[PDB]
Design a protein around this ligand. Structure first.
Ligand SMILES: [Cl-]
Length: 176
């Protein structure tokens, strides 16, 4: 019902619209109340090495050479733009990943805001990962934020870590 764009990742489209992205950090952050469930045995990863990270959680005791994790990134957006238009670029950063294949995609609104979610598999370091990637363009009062959540697992763990990744993906919530 909502048609996706093909040219330009969400970030590049906002750049080209003249918007500035300012990475937020959780301590002190009030504009939004974000729930990111933390499943049993997962913990916050101090010192993640995800640029612009707002919070990174992970299951450090997993099997797999790949540690299952969720990454949340929150940008305050400076400049005017139409969010519903920007959001139609929401799949493109995932669809550029090596060997991307899609399992689920939706551009339905999420908690009342324009949003995209795409889920699927891709290759990285000789390993197949399963991932779920949501962008939310949220409004708090007079500001706009891009909230982005990735939840990734090795494809070999996608069923074993299913209850964790599910509680994260489906418990996720963004409130102004
Ligand atoms: Cl704030």
């Amino acid at each position: 019902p909502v048609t996706p764009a093909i040219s330009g990742t969400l970030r590049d489209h906002l750049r080209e619209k003249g918007v500035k992205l300012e990475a937020q950090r959780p301590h002190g952050f009030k504009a939004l109340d974000i729930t990111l469930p933390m499943p049993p045995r997962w913990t916050q990863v101090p010192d993640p090495n995800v640029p612009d990270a707002f919070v990174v959680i992970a299951d450090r005791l997993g099997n797999s050479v790949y540690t299952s994790n969720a990454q949340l990134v929150v940008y305050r957006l400076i400049g005017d733009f139409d969010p519903a238009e920007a959001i139609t670029h929401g799949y493109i950063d995932s669809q550029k990943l090596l060997a991307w294949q899609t399992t689920n995609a939706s551009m339905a609104n999420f908690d009342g805001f324009p949003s995209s979610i795409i889920e699927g598999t891709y290759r990285e370091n000789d390993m197949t990962l399963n991932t779920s990637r949501r962008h939310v363009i949220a409004t708090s009062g007079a500001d706009k934020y891009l909230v982005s959540l990735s939840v990734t697992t090795a494809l070999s763990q996608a069923v074993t870590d299913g209850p964790a990744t599910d509680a994260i993906v489906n418990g996720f919530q963004v409130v102004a």
